[PDB]
């Protein structure tokens, strides 16, 4: 489970949660949202030039 804007502090923290996850034999991605914050994905091996 990945909460997008993790609010660690009670007053509020405003940091994203987008770890570089592995891609082994395919993945199943499900998103629950209400204001279209999920915008896509990037795929590759080293994610560089």
């Amino acid at each position: 489970w990945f909460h997008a804007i993790h609010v660690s502090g009670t007053n509020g923290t405003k940091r994203f949660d987008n770890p570089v996850l592995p891609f082994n034999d395919g993945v199943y991605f499900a998103s629950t949202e209400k204001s279209n914050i999920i915008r896509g994905w990037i795929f590759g091996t080293t994610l560089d030039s």
Epitope: N36, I38, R39, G40
Partner: nanobody, 117 residues
């Protein structure tokens, strides 16, 4: 792949073709539309039909073009009239299948309709 598109044929000026963006099955979309594209020219909008029923027309197409949806056969129908040679183009069927909030139209599979005497 999924959606498969075809229809139409070569005609002469003054004729009318009832082309359809014939689909392959029941589909979900919010604004179905049809494009054109001539060689050396960019794609230009022709008509727009939404789920609600809004019908958007380009400047060069009012007074001659009608759009009707057939939900029984799940296909919109694209009927031209008063055809002129300027309408010859690589006709496209951009779709409104939702994708990350809408997108990924299927206009790549087009039809070839040429208007000439």
């Amino acid at each position: 792949v999924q959606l498969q598109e075809s229809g139409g044929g070569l005609v002469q000026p003054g004729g009318s073709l009832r082309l359809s963006c014939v689909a392959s099955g029941s589909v979900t979309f919010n604004s179905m539309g049809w494009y054109r594209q001539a060689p050396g020219k960019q794609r230009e909008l022709v008509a727009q039909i939404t789920a609600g029923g809004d019908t958007h027309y380009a400047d060069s197409v009012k007074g001659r073009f009608t759009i009707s949806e057939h939900r029984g056969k799940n296909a919109v129908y694209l009927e031209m009239h008063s055809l002129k040679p300027e309408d010859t183009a690589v006709y496209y069927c951009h779709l409104q299948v939702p994708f990350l909030g809408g997108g990924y139209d299927y206009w790549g599979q087009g039809t070839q309709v040429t208007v000439s005497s």
